[PDB]
Subunit: 292 residues, 4 copies
């Protein structure tokens, strides 16, 4: 294996074509090809099928393409890390997120950590709970944020805190509900929940909380994320239910009523690989532990 | 509008090109064109357009296609329905279904109906919950079955009975759980649920019941229906959770364990138009009313 | 069985008798009589009997009457739906977006559309500008929203409106700039831009506006989208520059100063495939065009 | 950045001095030192300084050290993953089905596949035979299942089972036919056929069996699939002819009479593209062929 190969393989994949890839590398075709037979031989696997109506990846190719990406990322973040220790910096904490903690709870938490680790910087990437695990194992991300995490043997889950839930209506409905409400008050309200298929997801928790209180909720639809539901709510085409992180923000034409109920609550959680924690992660975990 | 026009339209829409539509109606090309010109001039819309790319329906065509199928279906019954009111007979109950009531709870109920109402016959069609309401309003179906129905203005919902739920594992795994279990025993089990979408659905109730018992269920995947889940469990590839109707049938290679709990239940429900009830329906409603 | 038989049967039942049925239908009697003979023969049942007070319904007659009403009610409704769809009163406009129009400008646009077409729905999908172009050609989506788009043959771009830019800082630094600032006040501020990737992007334009202004910006980083920029700014870790959509929302711990300058704006735009526009898209385009005059 | 640099740098820093590295690697000293000077140049800082004991690591030194091990580990797991996929130890088998193979052959086959390739997964979709053809040639599915299946250029149809036919009747009619019957015994029986759809289908098979015996069948109905046919049978509202796969399973309130009078075996066909089989399909094909 070698670093030129991984750039060149990624080149040939994304372009779907040998001539198109000569262009974006600014080199010629034959040395790309000889570098591809170099990779293929080092790995012991055919990555590419040099065919007619383009040029296709084999199954090994697709699998590796994902990994070759992650390898160039690790090295890129590792060059930053050495420059960072040289200057006396603590270096970059690579953080990933899914869902609505990003709106408030999680920034508040990064604030607190950054305040007592003042050379530390931060990266934020939206990733699914699955991409988050792949990244933690590869080393490309140190910690991951969401609400509900399935267990994975090499990963620890910490539940930091609970956040209340809020009804979200267009501003023209503000009067109907007030500042507080009960799940019982919402049985006739048509809900747009989110996300689709993260299962079990935030929508399942919402739906579950209604069922716990003996109500089948009116579900109009399930949209990809809070962004979509908030936008539809803003446009007068939807109501929704969001965590407190979203309701702590003041969106024009959206109004919020806190749902009262000791049970009506969702977690911020994070996950991290427990095997080989770099110092910055270890420091960060000690921080979020005494936050829990 | 004429029935021949509807019929030729459907054929042109499914077949996608004039040559294929002519072969399928055992008629030449120009009579089809005439019938479609006639149809568009009566409705006052262009339903379809012909190019070198063949037939392409317009949006109005897609809208009409769906209704034109229903119009013919309803017409086709009027024969034997009039030919039954003449005989003194009660005639045919047209029933839809979605989900697992079809495996046993529904068949038993239909049996009880047929057995006390002997000049009655029944027909049965799979239909999504939305398609069921569509069909109620169109008079194509007298009554639908599933478990959880969203409310719709001139529709009634009767909750008839409740069904237990059962864990479904491969027979090799039988010793793990025995013949009964509780949801708390299943916290480690990778579950396959169904359906996708149609929220809240059977999968939502299952996830909800876990959450009511204090557990985040471990969900490996959500498949399209009971059939895929059962076959995946038969293959050793899954564990699932199903209503009693499914577990009453001795599928090979599946071990079922009844899940015990007061809340661990799912309804059999039906829906019908609550306004223009024909005698067959009114008789069936009386019959169900009582079973409930 | 035929539609004329169904109209004719209903008229017979209402009219009471044949002479009445004929005037009701602006038709002579023999055509009606012959149609009803044909009906009775196609079904193989007796539906009416010619006697004293005109025409009277058998059991099967009454049963066929109800079904005859049902077939015509549905035919009539199906004509109505078919035609609403042609006019664009019904249907789901499939919409995609990239970047910050989603925060304000796009929601308002949709609110007007959905208000003017109350039987329409909308679905929303995050999408890179390239995914948008592929979805348009394929018919997977009807319209896409961003700021700057690459050109494509069968795709029209509409520049709808312009949005002011705002400096975004942590609440702690609010005092340093006040309610407004100029590009040249910002030469020492470490900026976090966005997005990297979908280029020409907002980031490039911000940089462009500094170049034109004769200022070299201190760019600490280009992060992946506005959500990263704003989160980091909320965490005290960054400053950024954002469109008015973002500035209109009130985030805890974030403060904004409007960047003054008539040229300091960014467009909101949308693309759609121009040729085979389904009627619900045609309707949305009328609303897009009149919004771009305003 | 290069893999030579990383592999040496770790050695330099495990054995202490520039010379003892040339021992463990079997290299020499001047090549190593050119690498550590091209590395330090590329990174932009110094990882080692030449004191009297040997060389020691800067703060940037121990930083890149951990990040270099982690790059080689990730690089090695990536190679593993990529050969695992190439051999087919790993990957998802996307299966489609139409009709009654879902009741026995399909999940028996998946069982043998998953048992002997334990880290493989499977998906499962119902799919008409036309959709199946399009899926296989598009790569979206790997393998299909049906009774009969039209011959197509790039498609292999393998015959995997040959099944008997049984009459199915409500439990109450069991004594009327016994445990075996002949077609001639069925001439007064109102039969429900299935499916309508992918024709020629099991429905044509049954129609054909009567045509060949010169017996006119009473066809009361043709319903969507076996599920509908069995439900009507269970409800006392029908009789049907079914494959063995269905008759083998105990169904509450359904009795089965084997149709004898011989020469009657209904095929089950497995299908897949002949060319460019992914490793995960090539593997499944092993079991398919063993089943033929």
């Amino acid at each position: 294996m070698e670093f030129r190969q991984l750039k060149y393989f990624i080149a040939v994949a994304e372009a779907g074509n040998m001539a198109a890839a000569a262009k974006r590398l600014h080199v010629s075709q034959p040395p790309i090809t000889r570098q591809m037979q170099a990779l293929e031989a080092d790995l012991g696997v055919v990555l590419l099928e040099r065919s007619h109506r383009g040029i296709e990846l084999t199954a090994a190719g697709h699998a590796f393409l994902e990994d070759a990406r992650r390898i160039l990322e690790l090295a890129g973040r590792s060059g930053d890390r050495s420059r960072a220790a040289a200057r006396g910096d603590v270096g970059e904490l690579s953080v990933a997120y899914f869902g609505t903690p990003i709106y408030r709870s999680l920034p508040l938490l990064l604030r607190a950590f950054l305040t007592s680790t003042p050379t530390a910087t931060v990266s934020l990437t939206h990733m699914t709970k699955d991409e988050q695990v792949e990244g933690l194992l590869a080393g490309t991300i140190h910690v991951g944020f969401s609400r509900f995490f399935p267990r994975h043997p090499g990963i620890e889950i910490v539940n930091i805190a609970q956040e209340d839930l809020y009804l979200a209506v267009h501003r023209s409905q503000s009067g109907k509900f007030g500042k507080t409400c009960k799940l019982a008050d919402l049985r006739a309200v048509e809900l747009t929940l989110f996300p689709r298929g993260g299962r079990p997801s935030f929508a399942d928790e919402v739906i579950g909380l209604f069922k716990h209180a003996g109500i089948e909720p009116r579900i109009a639809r399930v949209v990809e994320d809070a962004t979509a539901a908030l936008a539809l709510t803003m446009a007068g085409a939807a109501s929704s239910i969001v965590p407190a992180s979203v309701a702590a923000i003041r969106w024009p034409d959206i109004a919020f009523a806190r749902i009262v109920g000791t049970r009506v609550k969702v977690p911020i959680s994070c996950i991290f690989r427990k095997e080989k924690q770099p110092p910055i992660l270890a420091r960060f975990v000690e921080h979020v532990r005494r936050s829990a």
